[PDB]
């Protein structure tokens, strides 16, 4: 009946029990255990009180290693004696030795082959690194095996750059300089990464295409699948990740040219040479990859549960999250999975006493997310014609605890106000904030870089289940979790990310002993969904969108102004974008005034206003999409092409301007820049006009 009862019903012990339940056997996507977990989720959600729980199923292309023929990178002498063999598997965590179906580390969707060649260190395999090798360092990676280090970019971009350079194979490894927090013991006696720990993950470049074999349509039973040779974003060279305990052996013999800069150098006790091949003593020795992993179409299952809306059942508020894991997923994703389970239980125990939400709530335990966001993307593809007209908002719930320091929220500007209000009502679990709101602790620990007194809220990027809903469909999204101290630790992710050591004991001891942080994240997501699907008027504010639009326009304008002579010569102008932003600001002000003054009693008018608020986000979607990326259609927040995961807003103009001084034809590039400016200005003006008077 009240949000306070819902928030008080959530308990940390239930989170602990659900996490324990979900983190005891492997739950890799496409396996039998994942199917059994899906059945358990269905049964428990049915018992909790959900109106209807279903197991949607699809047949998507996954990748598995050959259990008969394990993958391993070797070093071969002149006669190919394989003097050094890499580790076949990482040592199991204590108490999990008898557990079976622990897949060895592998890069999903890597092709086969037995490539031979010399080694070239490429630092983080970024575009800038390859630029430094070829333009400055005079190194031709073509025909050589490329070895990189995890961090600062996505694995897919690493493999794509290595492919463009012409390499034969890719070896990824985790340096202690990026995944070993100082003063922290390894997993058996801490939360740091040991030498055997290997990070997993796909290496695909689907650009939000979902199933590689069915671009644009769901992979149901009556589906036509293209040839793998014609599949979308499939790597063409073998890739296999190792731990630093083996990369040290790979790089100790490395010789040739010196490292370009101390930035390239890591923490391993190796010269970190870049020069192809080993030193003079071992120049004849080469590195041979042994990858025999295969691809196969297998069946994945998403669990979809429905809580029908009392007043507006057609408007769906979705609480997503995925269930597939790599080995045990003590954090990714079973922390979010347990939080979702407890939120569903609280919703059900409120429903069993007569309560019903004003709007329909769709809960979703996705699948095969670690394989390219396949399950959620295919489900959204199947139900796109419904979600585009009925999807109020989407709330993603992936791994909840990243560190015990402070909250972290990534959401659309339409939710910022709501994000603040709920955070003021909740309590802060952090130390030095007993009897204090989560708002003040979040603000002090994470001040906004621009404003003062407001907490920092980052942008919504990609790489999770919100991607299909936000970047293509255009549904307002939001994620909240707990993370590390942003300005101090200075290492990417967490040391045991996507590893066999991501067990339950890790969460229970070194990340959340009392589950108060999990409880707080559960309260945040649950109250967010509650206020989203229960408020009379949708808690959306467009003034925040206007402000951030002006900020993004200024940033892109400065990036363009970096080339004043070129813009003067080709008459590149940004006046249209600024006029569009100003008109958006004025129209948003008028619409907000109308929201403040309107009769809420009349249901038709309230439906009109809430529809306007709903479709404001959808107005930014470009039907044609970004160039070469038809499935990225968000004009403002779509991922960038070149410098993705670090890119700027207005991805079209930003991508057009990227490395524009290296183009052979400046006129064509600046014409493309003008075209993207035109597209952005028209999109902003149209999204503003959707808030104008309705005839």
């Amino acid at each position: 009946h009240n949000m306070k009862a819902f928030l008080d019903e959530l308990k940390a012990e239930n989170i602990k029990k659900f996490l324990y339940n979900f983190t005891q056997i492997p739950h890799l996507a496409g396996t039998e255990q994942n199917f059994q977990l899906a059945k358990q989720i269905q049964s428990q959600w049915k018992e909790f009180g959900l109106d209807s729980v279903e197991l949607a199923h699809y047949d998507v292309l996954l990748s598995y290693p050959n259990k008969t023929h394990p993958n391993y990178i070797s070093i071969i002498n002149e006669d190919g004696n394989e003097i050094f063999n890499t580790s076949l598997f990482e040592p199991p965590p204590p108490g999990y030795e008898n557990v079976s179906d622990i897949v060895p580390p592998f890069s999903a969707f890597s092709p086969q082959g037995m490539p031979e060649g010399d080694l070239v260190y490429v630092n983080y395999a970024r575009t800038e690194d390859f630029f430094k090798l070829e333009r400055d360092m005079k190194i031709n990676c073509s025909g050589k095996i490329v070895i990189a280090r995890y961090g600062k970019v996505f694995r897919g971009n690493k493999v794509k750059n290595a492919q463009l350079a012409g390499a034969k194979g890719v070896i990824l490894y985790s340096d202690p300089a990026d995944y070993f927090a100082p003063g922290v013991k390894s997993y058996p006696d801490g939360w740091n990464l040991p030498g055997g720990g290997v990070q997993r993950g796909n290496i695909l470049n689907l650009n939000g295409a979902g199933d590689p074999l069915t671009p644009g349509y769901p992979a149901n039973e009556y589906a036509y699948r293209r040839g793998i040779a014609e599949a979308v974003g499939l790597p063409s060279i073998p890739v296999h990740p190792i731990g630093y305990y083996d990369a040290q052996k790979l790089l100790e013999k490395m010789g040739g040219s010196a490292p370009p800069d101390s930035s390239w150098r890591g923490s391993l006790k190796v010269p970190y040479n870049v020069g192809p091949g080993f030193t003079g003593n071992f120049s004849t020795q080469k590195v041979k990859m042994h990858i025999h992993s295969t691809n196969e179409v297998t069946r994945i299952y998403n669990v979809i549960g429905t809580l029908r809306g009392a007043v507006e059942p057609d408007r769906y508020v979705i609480l997503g999250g995925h269930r597939d894991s790599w080995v045990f997923g003590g954090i990714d994703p079973q922390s979010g999975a347990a939080v979702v389970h407890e939120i569903v239980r609280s919703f059900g125990t409120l429903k069993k006493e007569g309560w019903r939400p004003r709007r329909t709530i769709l809960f979703a335990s996705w699948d095969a997310e670690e394989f390219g966001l396949l399950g959620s993307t295919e489900w959204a593809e199947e139900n796109s014609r419904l979600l585009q007209e009925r999807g109020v908002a989407y709330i993603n719930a992936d791994s909840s605890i990243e560190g015990n320091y402070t909250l972290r929220v990534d959401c659309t500007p339409l939710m910022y106000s709501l994000v603040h209000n709920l955070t003021k009502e909740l309590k802060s679990p952090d130390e030095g904030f007993e009897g204090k709101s989560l708002y003040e602790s979040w603000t002090k620990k994470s001040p906004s870089p621009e404003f003062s007194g407001m907490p920092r809220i980052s942008k919504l990027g990609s790489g999770n289940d919100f991607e299909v809903f936000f970047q293509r469909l255009g549904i307002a999204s939001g994620r909240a979790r707990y993370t590390k101290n942003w300005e101090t630790n200075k290492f990417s992710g967490y040391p045991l990310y996507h590893s066999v050591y991501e067990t339950y004991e890790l969460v229970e001891k070194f990340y959340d002993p009392m589950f108060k942080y999990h409880l707080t994240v559960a309260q945040v997501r649950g109250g967010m969904v509650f206020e989203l699907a229960n408020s009379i008027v949708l808690p959306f504010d467009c003034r925040d969108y206007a402000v951030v639009l002006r900020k993004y326009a200024d940033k892109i304008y400065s990036i363009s102004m970096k080339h004043p002579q070129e813009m003067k010569t080709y008459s590149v102008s940004f006046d249209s974008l600024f006029s569009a932003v100003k008109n958006f600001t004025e129209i948003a002000s008028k619409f907000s005034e109308r929201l403040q003054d309107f009769d809420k009693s009349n249901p038709i008018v309230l439906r009109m206003m809430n529809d306007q608020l709903m479709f404001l986000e959808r107005a930014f979607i470009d039907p044609l999409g970004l160039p070469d990326r038809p499935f990225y259609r968000h004009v403002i927040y779509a991922p960038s092409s070149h410098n993705k995961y670090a890119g700027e807003s207005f991805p079209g103009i930003y991508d057009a301007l990227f490395d524009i001084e290296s183009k052979v034809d400046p006129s064509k590039a600046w014409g493309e820049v003008k075209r993207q400016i035109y597209v952005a200005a028209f999109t902003v003006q149209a999204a503003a006009e959707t808030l104008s008077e309705v005839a």
Epitope: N85, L88, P91, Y245
Partner: nanobody
């Protein structure tokens, strides 16, 4: 306690092949890695080849990599080392060296539990 019982010694003329197999009895730790050290009668102690519980191995004697190979089975908790085309300079004493860390190193100081040793003579 842990006992590295060594066996498989012999005295075969040049060109022969010897098998040096040793078990790992009483090892309580979950993770292990051990190495086959060779000491000449008139020289110091040097590593030859190491293996780990992670099914990773290396031969440090790159000059005679073809002659020497290393294999293990965790079912028997046993490791074998195979000779090819033995030569007179191979006459030496071979020790086991086992340690907790699942790494491979040529340093004899990093190993605490040492094997009995085995004489190998090649004429």
């Amino acid at each position: 306690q842990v006992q590295l019982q060594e066996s498989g010694g012999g005295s075969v003329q040049a060109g022969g092949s010897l098998r040096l197999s040793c078990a790992r009895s009483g090892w309580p730790y979950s993770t292990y890695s051990m190495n086959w050290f060779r000491q000449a009668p008139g020289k110091e102690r040097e590593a030859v080849a190491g293996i780990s519980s992670t099914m990773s191995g290396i031969i440090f004697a790159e000059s005679k990599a073809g002659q020497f190979t290393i294999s293990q089975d965790n079912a028997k908790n046993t490791v074998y080392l195979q000779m090819n085309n033995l030569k007179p300079e191979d006459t030496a004493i071979y020790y086991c060296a086992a340690r907790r860390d699942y790494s491979l190193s040529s340093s004899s100081d990093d190993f605490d539990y040492w094997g009995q040793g085995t004489q190998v003579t090649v004429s």
